[PDB]
Amino acid sequence: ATITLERDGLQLVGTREEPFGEIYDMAIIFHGFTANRNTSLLREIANSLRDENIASVRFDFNGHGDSDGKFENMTVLNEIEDANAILNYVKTDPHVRNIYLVGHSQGGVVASMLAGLYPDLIKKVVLLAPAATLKGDALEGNTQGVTYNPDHIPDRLPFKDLTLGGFYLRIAQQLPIYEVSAQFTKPVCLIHGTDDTVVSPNASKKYDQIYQNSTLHLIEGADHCFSDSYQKNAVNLTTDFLQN
Amino acid sequence: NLYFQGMATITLERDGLQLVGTREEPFGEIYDMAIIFHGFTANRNTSLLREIANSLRDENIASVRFDFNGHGDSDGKFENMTVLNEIEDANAILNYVKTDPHVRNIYLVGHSQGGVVASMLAGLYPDLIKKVVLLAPAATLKGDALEGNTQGVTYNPDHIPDRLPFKDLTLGGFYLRIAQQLPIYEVSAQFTKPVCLIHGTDDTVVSPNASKKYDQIYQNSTLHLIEGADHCFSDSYQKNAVNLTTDFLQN
Ligand code: NA
Ligand code: NA
Ligand code: NA
């Protein structure tokens, strides 16, 4: 049902997907930049794993969806602290046996980098279109088509309908994404479609070259938010990988 | 402001928590500002932090010092404190400091762990920060975490626990994993602007080579190897550190 946690005086609200039994494995589903806990792609990954004896938890990040916090004061950094607060709960739960991390878009950087700091704890990582391009993007003064000077990052910038802060782009510019991630040497699943416009498939190609044990799945024709017909495939690879 | 000058108690907000602080104002309605960071298990009002705050005001330079999360009057469990979220604490102070009418230039100052917080925020904010003063900066903490002995307390650095008992409190295991992979030198090195480094020869807490590696890595460094001095600039040495911090920020 709807479960609740805390990270430095901010409430983190999530949907736990629970299977039948006393002992089960559990996955932590992280969403991307401007996304929320319960979207089509994540909701179906959440559902699918439950049918195969795996539990799951999806939470809104600080400044996203139902959780507390301003979007203005959100960073990939404070999002990893959110990711750690969820892991504190998950690793302290009596029913939870083996932990997995599944991350789409920016949540793909949040999950890989959280797995970099917890390689001894996390048993598997499924990386769907990981937004590791967000560093090289912030460094060239262009994020999702919204510009700035990478040597003059303002206090706040209008983004679509929202307003993100400078500190987000300060951190993004000097994030040791691959560095921290390469610390995770256990199984990794990489899912990236050739038709991705937001995040380049070269982020997943870079990720594969740096991992010890990683499978690269380049699904021909698949977009960024793994839409329509391409969804069931993505969900199938995540499910098949997480049980094996 | 010139009217409300001397000392003040200020309360900031950072992603849910409350960071209680101390503001020292000089005379005139346009002055320079120093952000003062204390180190590991300490607070904003210790003899050294108090004498740097007083001394800079006696040269008409304002100062701000806050307790980090899990320290002093600031909110949060000591268990949930990492180096990373102290930078978040620091950024929040900078969000306050950069949006103040009377603030001419910003200066970053940090002792021990505050020194990492200072070098690491100075590198994320090079266009704003004008000068940086690092007193025995605890960059060693990363190497102390890779080894598995933080301030004498042993632990497996490959199987770091959830929480681990400390001197009087309980240290979070995510702090250990955080500092063990902290890009201290990487981020620090981005600051090309003037850096003043102060380290004690007889320091057993932070190896003086931390300030030497700092000095090495910086484009505009000035190292001061105060002889006989320990980690906490005290007695015949406090007066030496406070002056250098003042004199380098004196124009
Ligand atoms: Na349910
Ligand atoms: Na149990
Ligand atoms: Na970092």
Numbering used by the authors:
A (entry chain B): 2 to 245
B (entry chain A): -5 to 245
What does the article say, verbatim?
We previously showed that LJ0536, a cinnamoyl esterase purified from L. johnsonii N6.2, is active towards a variety of substrates including short acyl chain aliphatic esters and phenolic esters. Two classical serine esterase motifs (GlyXSerXGly) can be recognized from the amino acid sequence, and the structure revealed that the catalytic triad of the enzyme is formed by Ser106, His225, and Asp197, while the other motif is non-functional. The structure revealed a prominent inserted α/β subdomain of 54 amino acids, from which multiple contacts to the aromatic acyl groups of the substrates are made.
The apo-LJ0536 structure was crystallized in the presence of protease, which facilitated successful crystal growth (the mutant Ser106Ala was also crystallized in the presence of protease). This interface is formed by α4, α6, and β1. As calculated by the PDBe PISA (Protein Interactions, Surfaces, Assemblies) server, which identifies interfaces between proteins by measuring their buried surface area, the dimer interface comprises 34 and 37 residues of chain A and chain B, respectively, burying a total of 2373 Å2 between the two chains. The interface is primarily hydrophobic (18/37 residues from chain B), although there are six salt-bridges as well. Due to these characteristics, this interface is presumed to be the dimer interface of the protein. The presumed catalytic pocket resembles an open canal-like feature, which has the shape of a boomerang that ends in a hydrophobic pocket buried between the α5 and α6 of the inserted α/β subdomain. Overall, we observed no appreciable differences in the backbone structure between the apo wild-type (WT) enzyme and the Ser106Ala mutant (RMSD of 0.33 Å over all 244 Cα atoms). The inserted α/β subdomain of LJ0536 adopts the same conformation in the apo and ligand-bound structures, suggesting that this is a rigid structure.
